[PDB]
């Protein structure tokens, strides 16, 4: 499992969201961030390793404009995920 | 050392906070997040490996309601922690 | 590559920012966080492994005051970085 964090232009949110739903990406967290100080959105998703590349492509395709400031995607390892409602774990 | 991030229902904050203090969990960071777009809180703590399971349980017990949307906990590795005040590593 | 997250006193931002520019640190993300509930800023940067220690020192030197609440720095692994504009990966 990997965490994928994407720093995108705020107005791209909808587009990106749509794409991620189309790839059956379920859980997803978004927070307001300042980068460059420009306002950006940070999207966080956690997916299986096999999905990573796929997801990246879609985000890229949805978040891209062609100009500097399109932002960036970071992939990092996740050891464990726990669903609070049930306490179910996957590793 | 592991980073523990929990995305919870905002109103659960107090409860969760209490529990974490009861387990001697000291440093803790909280930010507003939108998930699902519902308002959530993201809590971040960094603890020793041996504490991980314990902490998870408490968070679960404190943050749970029984309904969809209770949120999620992610555990990820941390290589290094540095205290800014002293530079201790 | 490593992600460096620093939780600092808000007013230190400028100082810290200057220092990071002086070490050629380019991309950098800042968000408002509540820690301890005191208002803090979380700075996130991703750098090559070889840079890590350097960066840490500068942040420390820039963010420090000597009192409790100076905050903390966490270093964690990053597997992959992708530039959205081009799709370039490292």
Swiss-Prot record, chain A:
The keyword Mitochondrion does not apply. The gene is glnB. GO terms for biological process: regulation of nitrogen utilization. Keywords: Nucleotide-binding, Phosphoprotein, Transcription, Transcription regulation. GO terms for molecular function: ATP binding; enzyme regulator activity; identical protein binding. GO terms for cellular component: cytosol. InterPro entries: N-reg_PII, N-reg_PII-like_a/b, N-reg_PII/ATP_PRibTrfase_C, N-reg_PII_CS, N-reg_PII_urydylation_site. This is Nitrogen regulatory protein P-II. Coiled coil: none annotated. It comes from the Bacteria. It comes from Synechococcus elongatus (strain ATCC 33912 / PCC 7942 / FACHB-805). P-II indirectly controls the transcription of the GS gene (glnA). P-II prevents NR-II-catalyzed conversion of NR-I to NR-I-phosphate, the transcriptional activator of glnA. When P-II is phosphorylated, these events are reversed. In nitrogen-limiting conditions, when the ratio of Gln to 2-ketoglutarate decreases, P-II is phosphorylated which allows the deadenylation of glutamine synthetase (GS), thus activating the enzyme.
Swiss-Prot record, chain B:
It comes from the Bacteria. GO terms for molecular function: ATP binding; enzyme regulator activity; identical protein binding. Coiled coil: none annotated. Keywords: Nucleotide-binding, Phosphoprotein, Transcription, Transcription regulation. Phosphorylation dependent on the nitrogen source and spectral light quality. One of its GO terms (biological process) is regulation of nitrogen utilization. GO terms for cellular component: cytosol. P-II indirectly controls the transcription of the GS gene (glnA). P-II prevents NR-II-catalyzed conversion of NR-I to NR-I-phosphate, the transcriptional activator of glnA. When P-II is phosphorylated, these events are reversed. In nitrogen-limiting conditions, when the ratio of Gln to 2-ketoglutarate decreases, P-II is phosphorylated which allows the deadenylation of glutamine synthetase (GS), thus activating the enzyme. Belongs to the P(II) protein family. Homotrimer. This is Nitrogen regulatory protein P-II. It comes from Synechococcus elongatus (strain ATCC 33912 / PCC 7942 / FACHB-805). The gene is glnB.
């Amino acid at each position: 499992m990997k965490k994928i964090e994407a720093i995108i232009r705020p107005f791209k949110l909808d587009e990106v969201k749509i794409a991620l739903v189309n790839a059956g990406i379920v859980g997803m967290t978004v927070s307001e961030v300042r980068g460059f100080f420009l306002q950006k959105l940070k999207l966080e998703i956690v997916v299986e390793d096999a999905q990573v590349d796929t997801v990246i492509d879609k985000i890229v395709a949805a978040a891209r404009t062609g100009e500097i400031g399109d932002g960036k995607i970071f992939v990092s390892p996740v050891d464990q995920t726990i669903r609070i409602r049930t306490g179910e774990k996957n590793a």
